[PDB]
């Protein structure tokens, strides 16, 4: 049987006692064929555990209280899930003379009732006073149908959102309105369900996080090359000037800042160099980032050779101390 | 003896930076020819570069880590020779920088990892790999080429397929591993652009734990049947094993257990209205293979009439009938119609008849009968076969001719009268009258007349004033029938 062993690129986690449903890696990941042209090709698709802190393997009895573990398709259910379910899992497509096979590892986490959990949020990043961006409650595809609508609560880090300044809960989807760096963190959605008589929940956080405007964006912004202090003194030459660039937010940026000593700062020879660096984020997360450099020993010539610093992100600009 | 000639020869390569390339060459001749690597004409010499051959004679690879630019970059040649001959192969290293990696050079996303497997089990090592074009996956074992070339044996070569905008999946699969199979693995992504090597991963191979996997067995194998229509039958099938296994019936093609609810070790298919005979197979799987049995199913009707039965023997009073079966199945047993040839009534019927073969006693000499068999099975009788017709053998005759008288007609001459024998046995070909004036003599010392077919004879040439005794027999084509007892005639 074709084996593909572990599948720990894709380390699975779901919350106890709430509706997990569990895909069989094989039919889309690796294999190229549908259930559906699988089952139809006279393939039989075959799920076996082993617990974890097991050895052997079992199958799992279908025909068990209440259908808590169930199969369609490809995927498996639970519903709803337990602890002890947790394991490796092995899900196997076989033919007389065929079988490929895959593993893979589930999780089933705990849930403390402020949703602080062992699980890993998202994140959204809003665009501040951008007007409205809307987040909309994840995974929840496919857990019930059309005929059915749930009611979800929403909340924020572990209080329940009733009225706000500016967010707005609209069931499957959170509205923020003038989104202000005061509301940031992660929030969770419980969205619940019924399902043949009995109550289900689901539990989801997106740790949402605003950011500086796109408008607000452009080159950096050096000013330690200002030119209001220039530093001659004795040398003595004891005296460095700093080199402070602030950049605005960018969603996708390249920081990276270069002293330009005499156009070839990597380490020259008359002075013993090192690089040194920082940074610090701001309240909406624009940057600055700053870099000095240390000596050994002090050459007098270097003071007529004049100092420019440049950094580039996104943009390209360049002063120098004179 | 034979010059050297290439097996495998290398090809031009792009990698990066800090990363690995290696080139593989291999030749064969008579005798094992020699490889050396060169570089613009002169042999490699380099703390960079490793040579490592094969173990069957066939090659090196040289190895380059890690990847230094333009330093490494050249033409480089392998070069087979033996006392017989001697040739050379180019090709090209490229080198480039990661700030000069265009979009699309394969990537590492996940490479193999430590594993260690018991001996005899799967070990499988992983890699993921991306880029534009799907990169093609290949692997190392300590520097040497994995050769999965045959995909025939202990070791296989696995790849997931483009579901585009992915990460292409490779694995390396080491069936029954073995101490040998322990080393060092790498995986190798190359496209178009160049080559990337995963970090290297080392596989160990432990001795079993104790726990042993079983493979599926039919503990209870699903046995046949035969029922009446509509006509209802459980048959239960039962498998087991370590891991325990799924048990769905089946009708051949069609599943008849529902796939998402498939029972475990044990399946009993109920068949509800039996119309139509079939086979159905019971299929049991673990993660250690399939397996499969059959439940024959068959309806059986009342038998199909036997073959026309064959005469093979016949007496006087018996006919021995021989037939086929005529039918497919087993028969229980056989019934034997019988009845004279011009009779308008109903057969007579012999019954419980083991075999193809009987012998009809109690019959009549020199008769016509009439012969049909039936066959019988569990479930009832059939129609009866087409008819025999034959005859019974002939005997002589058992009872002399009746009513015999004699009269004179003159002192020389009698004229002698009969009536045919009640028990001819067969066709009267004529009778013999025996005569005498002595009685006491031994009839065939009496004087004889031979006629055909018919009930009366003159007979002459008699001595007058004598009493003649006169006997009478009916012969057919097999004897003589008895003599009539004396009666007495004067001329
Ligand atoms: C998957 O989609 C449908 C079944 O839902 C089928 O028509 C199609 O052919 C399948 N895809 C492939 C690649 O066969
Ligand atoms: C663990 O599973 C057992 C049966 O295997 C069940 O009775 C029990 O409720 C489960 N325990 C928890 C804490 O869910
Ligand atoms: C899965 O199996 C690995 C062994 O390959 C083991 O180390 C790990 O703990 C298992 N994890 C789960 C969730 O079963
Ligand atoms: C099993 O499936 C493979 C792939 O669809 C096919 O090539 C093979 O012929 C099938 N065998 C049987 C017995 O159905
Ligand atoms: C949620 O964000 C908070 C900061 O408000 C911090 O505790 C952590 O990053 C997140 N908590 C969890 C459980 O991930
Ligand atoms: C077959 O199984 C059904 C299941 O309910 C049962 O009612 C029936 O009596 C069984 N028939 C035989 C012949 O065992
Ligand atoms: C069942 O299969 C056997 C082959 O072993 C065959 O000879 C027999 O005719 C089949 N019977 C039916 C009813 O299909």
Redesign the pocket.
């Given at each position: 049987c074709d084996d593909w062993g572990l599948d720990t690129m894709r380390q699975i986690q779901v919350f106890e006692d709430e509706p997990a449903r569990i895909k069989c890696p094989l039919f889309e990941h690796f294999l190229k064929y549908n259930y559906s042209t699988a089952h139809s090709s006279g393939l039989t698709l075959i799920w076996y555990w082993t617990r974890q802190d097991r050895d052997l393997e079992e199958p799992i009895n279908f025909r068990l209280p209440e259908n808590r573990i169930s199969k369609e398709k490809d995927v498996l259910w639970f519903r709803p899930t337990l602890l002890n379910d947790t394991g490796n899992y092995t899900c196997m497509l076989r033919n007389t003379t065929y079988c490929s096979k895959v593993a893979f590892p589930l999780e089933v986490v705990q849930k403390d009732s402020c949703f602080?959990?062992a699980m890993r949020?998202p994140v959204h990043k809003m665009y501040i006073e951008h007007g409205i961006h809307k987040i909309t409650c994840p995974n929840v595809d496919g857990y019930f149908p059309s005929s059915v609508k749930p009611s979800v609560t929403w909340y924020k880090?572990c209080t329940e959102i009733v009225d706000f300044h500016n967010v707005l809960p609209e069931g499957m989807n959170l509205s923020f309105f003038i989104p202000l760096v005061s509301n940031n963190?992660?929030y969770t959605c419980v969205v619940t369900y019924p399902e043949n008589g009995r109550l289900f929940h689901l539990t989801r956080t997106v740790?949402v996080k605003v950011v500086g405007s796109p408008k607000d964006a452009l080159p950096p912004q050096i000013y330690s090359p200002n030119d209001r202090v220039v530093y001659e003194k004795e040398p003595g030459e004891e005296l460095v000037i700093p080199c402070k660039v602030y950049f605005s937010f960018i969603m996708d940026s390249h920081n990276e800042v270069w002293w330009t000593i005499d156009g070839k700062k990597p380490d020259d020879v008359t002075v013993d160099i090192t690089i040194n660096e920082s940074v610090s984020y701001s309240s909406t997360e624009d940057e600055t980032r700053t870099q000095i450099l240390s000596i050994k020993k002090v050459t007098p010539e270097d003071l007529r050779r004049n100092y420019v610093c440049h950094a580039r992100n996104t943009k390209g600009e360049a002063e120098q101390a004179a | 003896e034979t010059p050297p000639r290439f097996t495998r020869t290398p090809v031009d390569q792009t990698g990066v930076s800090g990363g690995v390339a290696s080139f593989i060459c291999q030749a064969t001749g008579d005798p094992r020819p020699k490889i050396v690597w060169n570089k613009k004409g002169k042999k490699v010499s380099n703390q960079r570069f490793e040579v490592i051959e094969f173990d069957d004679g066939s090659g090196s690879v040289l190895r380059i880590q890690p990847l230094r630019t333009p330093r490494d970059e050249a033409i480089y040649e392998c070069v087979a020779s033996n006392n017989v001959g001697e040739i050379s192969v180019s090709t090209r290293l490229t080198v480039l920088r990661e700030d000069q990696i265009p979009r699309g050079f394969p990537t590492i996303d996940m490479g193999p990892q430590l594993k260690v497997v018991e001996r005899t089990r799967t070990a499988t090592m992983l890699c993921a790999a991306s880029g534009n074009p799907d990169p093609e996956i290949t692997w190392f074992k300590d520097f040497l080429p994995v050769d999965t070339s045959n995909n025939n044996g202990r070791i296989k070569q696995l790849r997931s397929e483009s579901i585009g905008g992915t990460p292409i999946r490779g694995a390396l699969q080491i069936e029954q591993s073995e101490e040998s199979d322990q080393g060092k693995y790498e995986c190798v992504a190359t496209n178009s652009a160049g080559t990337r090597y995963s970090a290297p991963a080392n596989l160990y191979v432990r001795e079993l734990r104790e726990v042993r996997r079983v493979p599926p067995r039919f503990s209870i194998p699903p046995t046949n049947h035969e029922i009446m229509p509509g006509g209802s039958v459980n048959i239960t099938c039962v498998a087991v094993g370590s891991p325990m296994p799924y048990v769905k019936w089946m009708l051949g093609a069609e599943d008849l257990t529902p796939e998402d609810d498939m029972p475990i070790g044990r399946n009993v298919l109920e068949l509800n209205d039996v119309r139509q005979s079939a086979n159905y197979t019971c299929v049991a799987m673990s993660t250690l293979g399939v397996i499969e049995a059959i439940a024959q199913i068959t309806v059986k009707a009342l038998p199909k009439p036997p073959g026309t039965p064959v005469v093979t023997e016949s007496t006087a009073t018996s006919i021995t009938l021989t037939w086929d079966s005529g039918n497919p199945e087993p028969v229980s047993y056989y019934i034997i119609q019988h009845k004279p040839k011009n009779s308008e009534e109903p057969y007579k019927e012999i019954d419980g008849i083991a075999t193809t073969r009987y012998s009809v006693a109690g019959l009549s000499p020199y008769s016509d009968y009439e012969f049909r068999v039936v066959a019988v099975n569990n479930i009832g009788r059939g129609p009866a076969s087409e008819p025999v017709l034959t005859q019974t053998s002939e005997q002589a005759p058992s009872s002399a001719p009746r009513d015999v008288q004699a009269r004179m007609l003159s002192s020389t001459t009698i004229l002698v009268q009969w009536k045919e024998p009640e028990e001819p046995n067969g066709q009267i070909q004529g009778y013999r009258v025996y005569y005498t004036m002595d009685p006491t003599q031994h009839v065939n010392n009496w004087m004889k007349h031979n006629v055909a077919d018919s009930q009366i004879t003159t007979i002459g040439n008699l001595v007058p004033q004598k009493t003649y005794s006169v006997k009478v027999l009916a012969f057919t084509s097999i004897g003589d029938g008895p003599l009539s007892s004396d009666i007495q005639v004067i001329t």
């Open positions: 602080n959990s949020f880090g963190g992660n740790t | -």
